[PDB]
Amino acid sequence: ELDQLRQEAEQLKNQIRDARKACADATLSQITNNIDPVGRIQMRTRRTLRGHLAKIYAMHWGTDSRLLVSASQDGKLIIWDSYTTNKVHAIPLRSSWVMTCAYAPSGNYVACGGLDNICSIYNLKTREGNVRVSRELAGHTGYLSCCRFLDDNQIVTSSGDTTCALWDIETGQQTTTFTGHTGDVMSLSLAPDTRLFVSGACDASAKLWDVREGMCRQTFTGHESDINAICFFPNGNAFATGSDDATCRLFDLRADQELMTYSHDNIICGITSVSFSKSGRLLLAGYDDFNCNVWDALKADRAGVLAGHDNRVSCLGVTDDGMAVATGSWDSFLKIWN
Amino acid sequence: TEDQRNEEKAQREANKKIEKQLQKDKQVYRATHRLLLLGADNSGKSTIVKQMRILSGGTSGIFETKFQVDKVNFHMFDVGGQRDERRKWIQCFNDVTAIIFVVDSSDYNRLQEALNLFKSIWNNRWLRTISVILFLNKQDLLAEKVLAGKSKIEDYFPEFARYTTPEDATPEPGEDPRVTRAKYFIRDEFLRISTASGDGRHYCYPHFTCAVDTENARRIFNDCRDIIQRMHLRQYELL
């Protein structure tokens, strides 16, 4: 039945490809040709945030749209006030190879992790007043790429062992394990209703996962190289991916296929970080050619450029109210833009 | 109003405490020199770590070796916990002073794998400013392999027959000229990879080391000194 199983699997792939091509023939680009363009988007470095010794991979905005956390591989996790450029907190790390950081939506905890294969949860609100490590989550067999807080007791981590994992923080055990990627999973984004999360890996594929069901609903392909960054559209029915093939892509969940491609001939370096604005009309992407491009997400035009970093842009974040964009880089500086 | 004045000056003094702590951390960070140990299982890169530990603490997979050469601190990181794919986590080591590359030179079957790994490191976009300190380990096993016969280099490298010793550069580690020609052919393979690309930003520093060799820390010290001198000479001088 080996030939029958292979025939069934090939027929399954052909059937779902035909189902996608029959599901929709129109494009969002031809839908939005009547829509007026955004025009030039001018953003200025409203703040420069200095104090990291080494390069920065990750930042995460707090839900207050004022505080933020940044992780650098000098061994520091620094929590900054963006309005007044004051360093609220500076957490020294046991392992100096941190690659991700997440700030809990309540504001009480922060997370980090990296090549140590461990997610460290640091408690900010302590009676003694100085921050300790609350929990130490071990069990991944690769480096940790991305982590995001569902709430104060649930954490979801993507790792280099091709698996994602939902952990219950207080018991320190893997509640759920999400398997199915063949390459190293690099980024994940939570849905607005926190019931679903997408994850892109180094197999040029993105996967949508149900958090409670524990299995993968849908698989999205189209990229030609490793996917480095993924982010939901604010509605939650779509998401954008950035990958090493110098291309950004917009996929929809219900149509289960790619809606747009954001690329230009002169762009040859990969995308390291992506994010959406609050409306979803502007898609911001960080690149390895040392600057960021703001894209009109509805007609795929380069609306603006955020130059001002002397090295590659590793992280990029937009606030919940959408007021500012924070850009980190390998030149050890963050920049707040409006 | 008054309470927000209290809050903002408390925030400013907390920032000042953080900033003085970070400048102390900056001094400690600049004092040490970070190395990435890289290699394979057949190479004895864990052994050379053991000589610098004389001259498994790390439970996170990644190994840390702190060694002290003439009041200069070296922190060498051996990454072992990860998978075989290394595209993404090798980018964490762009600011490393030097990559330590350890090769088993007696084993000829995996020499081409080591050469390909060296080529990928040398031509990587984020590693093209990092000089490589190349250690050719188990040179005593290289000598017994070539003298006993039955394992010829010519089977794995067909251009060894058309190769001669460059100038008989340092005959004392390998007495017999067959051993010398073998080790210098391997060294020239790695350096013809090195000299093909890289616009003076980084250079290879080959060494011939045994298993029981005890001067590898001094070799790393001298090569790192040359690396920093070449970096300064490239920075503010065209020459």
Epitope: D203, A204, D245, I268 | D84
Partner: nanobody, 126 residues
């Protein structure tokens, strides 16, 4: 979908000649360096040959440069390996491997794990 499909293989008398063809779909062919890798029975994956984006830069392994001839058709999006004078050491499973990022001179293609940009493979017996 990034797909690589190998064709050609099978039994051959020693000293024979085969032409392995790798059809590539789901990516631009011209912008990636291509490799030929093989896995001997009861042995790990070892790299055999590589060819640059244009096809000018070409290199081979210890299996002699004269026996094997790598070539690429960027218009046809396909990768050829011409295998001459087969020896019994050449019995292996042969994979065409795209190396992961475009515009690069560095490639990491011989990982034992599920390296994504590698074909399902073809069997050459001799």
């Amino acid at each position: 979908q990034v797909q690589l499909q190998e064709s050609g293989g099978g039994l051959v008398q020693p000293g024979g000649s085969l032409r392995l063809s790798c059809a590539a779909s789901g990516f631009t062919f011209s912008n990636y360096k291509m490799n030929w890798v093989r896995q001997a029975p009861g042995k790990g994956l070892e790299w055999v040959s590589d060819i640059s984006q244009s096809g000018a830069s070409i290199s081979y392994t210890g299996s002699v440069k004269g026996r094997f001839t790598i070539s690429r058709d960027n218009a046809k999006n396909t990768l050829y390996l011409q295998m001459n004078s087969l020896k019994p050491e050449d019995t292996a499973v042969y994979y065409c491997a795209r190396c992961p990022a475009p515009f690069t001179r560095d490639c990491f293609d011989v990982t034992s794990t599920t390296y994504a940009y590698r074909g399902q493979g073809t069997q050459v017996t001799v």
